[PDB]
């Protein structure tokens, strides 16, 4: 029983979701290896070597990994698999993990498991279906278990206490059927939505993007990340990467504050595991009140500013 974690990272910085995935991997009870691929892996590989729980770190550094295209990483991964014969291959259920892992599974001819929230044994996992409204326990009898891990369901592994050997990896010939052209990232100073301890989200109730400013001010006092619903995105108030829910990001902060959000099934799918949920909505019949630990039926344009002041 050997586990290969595919490390996610960018700009010599390791994606936090990889730390949660390492914890899930150690729960399997086998030796854990970590594959770091990309154009620049030297810093990250060193950091991963200190991460508690890792035994081996494989480094595949090459210009072909520009953009971390699945078509280029897959052959690398199959090579590593042939050579070390892992029984489990995983990655965090992020856009990167979801994009890559099902492609690898097809090449291995196995059925992958998506977004697991719990491990009962090396071959039995728990995941949610129907927008998180049902828990599905699955028994996987595949020769190789390929799965992605829900970051919020596992604690992050300690970034120290680990001893691991870095080793150069089985590097392949370029496929070149796809090419990375460019990107447009949403530059923000607020803390990342997925790792935030407090999250403040707004929906259609904010009427305009200028009004979202109120949420930013409130968020500041709480050092919170700001999220949104589809309505706010489609209306153009905020960018789509801020969307919380089934089609967006799944968060489980200590405190989630939903402002001007009805609480539709698809939104609850991404925040109903928050420790404490607060709802600010003028409609007393809004579904959000059914899951809110604390709720106030009032105008957000009145309550939000007041809360910011009380917080000052």
């Amino acid at each position: 029983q050997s586990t290969l974690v595919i490390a996610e990272h960018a700009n010599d910085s390791l994606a936090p979701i990889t730390l949660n995935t390492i914890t899930a991997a150690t729960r399997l009870g086998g030796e854990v290896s970590c594959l770091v691929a990309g154009t620049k892996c030297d810093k990250v590989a060193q950091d991963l070597c200190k991460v508690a729980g890792i035994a081996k770190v494989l480094v595949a550094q090459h210009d072909v990994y520009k953009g971390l295209l699945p078509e280029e990483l897959t052959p690398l991964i199959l090579a590593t698999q042939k050579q070390f014969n892992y029984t489990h291959i995983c990655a965090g259920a992020s856009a990167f993990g979801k994009n890559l892992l099902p492609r690898v599974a097809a090449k291995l001819e196995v059925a992958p498991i998506s977004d697991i929230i719990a491990i009962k044994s090396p071959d039995t996992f728990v995941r949610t279906i129907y927008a998180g409204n049902a828990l599905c326990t699955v028994k996987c009898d595949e020769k190789v278990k390929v799965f992605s891990v829900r970051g919020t369901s596992f604690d992050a592994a300690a970034t120290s206490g680990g001893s691991a050997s870095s080793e150069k990896a089985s590097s392949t010939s370029p496929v070149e059927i796809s090419e990375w052209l460019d990107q447009k990232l949403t530059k923000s100073d607020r803390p990342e939505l997925t790792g935030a301890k407090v999250v403040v989200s707004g929906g259609r109730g904010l009427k305009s993007g200028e009004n979202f400013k109120l949420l930013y001010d409130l968020a500041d006092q709480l050092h919170a990340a700001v999220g949104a619903s589809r309505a706010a995105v489609d209306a153009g108030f905020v960018p789509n990467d801020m969307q919380v829910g089934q089609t967006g990001k799944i968060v489980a902060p200590e405190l989630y504050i939903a402002v001007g959000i009805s609480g539709a099934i698809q939104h609850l799918a991404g925040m109903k595991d928050s420790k404490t949920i607060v709802a600010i909505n003028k409609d007393p019949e809004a579904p959000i009140f059914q899951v809110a630990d604390y709720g106030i039926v009032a105008d957000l344009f009145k309550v939000v500013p007041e809360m910011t002041e009380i917080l000052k």
């Binding site: 990167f96 099902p102 492609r103 049902a134 460019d182 607060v278 009140f289 604390y294």
Partner: protein, 252 residues
Amino acid sequence: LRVLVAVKRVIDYAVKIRVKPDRTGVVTDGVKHSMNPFCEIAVEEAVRLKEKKLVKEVIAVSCGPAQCQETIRTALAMGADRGIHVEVPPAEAERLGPLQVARVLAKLAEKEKVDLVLLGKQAIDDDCNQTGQMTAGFLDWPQGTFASQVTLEGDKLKVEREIDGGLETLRLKLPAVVTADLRLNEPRYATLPNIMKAKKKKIEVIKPGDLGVDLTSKLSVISVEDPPQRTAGVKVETTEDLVAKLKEIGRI
């Protein structure tokens, strides 16, 4: 180009699902079903390409019981040229997952000689987000997942994708596989006359076996259960009370 569009029949997104008391699945009998929202967007995109005269034919395909034929009809009424139903008996359909569907789509892609396969990025029931990626892997074609923008530039495809911290643009060599994200477009509504003409367009029915696809699965659902329920909350009359409440419980 020839496009292959995969559509799945699922329980309507607005429906409050109920887990069977025997914990073998969710109630489906007498429950409203409809085309998976992500699939609708894939179909709309295929049709738009045809309307821009960049695509010649659009084939809609669905795997599952006889009821899937209504889903295909819908795709036809939206503008798909012809449909293909890969029939699977209700009992066996319960075990149908991304792996089997991907294998079926891969065989159909080469059989039909399509240049592009469009899927939704995930089915709202299984929430797997796997079938498109697996199809591409089986076909050894490039993939453009979570696409919110698609452009045919001769023999290549320009795709802008939704990623965690923003957007990303790739260029893929045709043939390729693309999975649609909600942001790609707004699906049109099929009008009565189109729903009528859709009844004339014929659906080809085939079995997985006829394609050489084995439905064997090494995944087994042990159980399906209701998630743990949350303790009903309290309503605070003033903002001051709200903050007071949060402070005493150590959230603030």
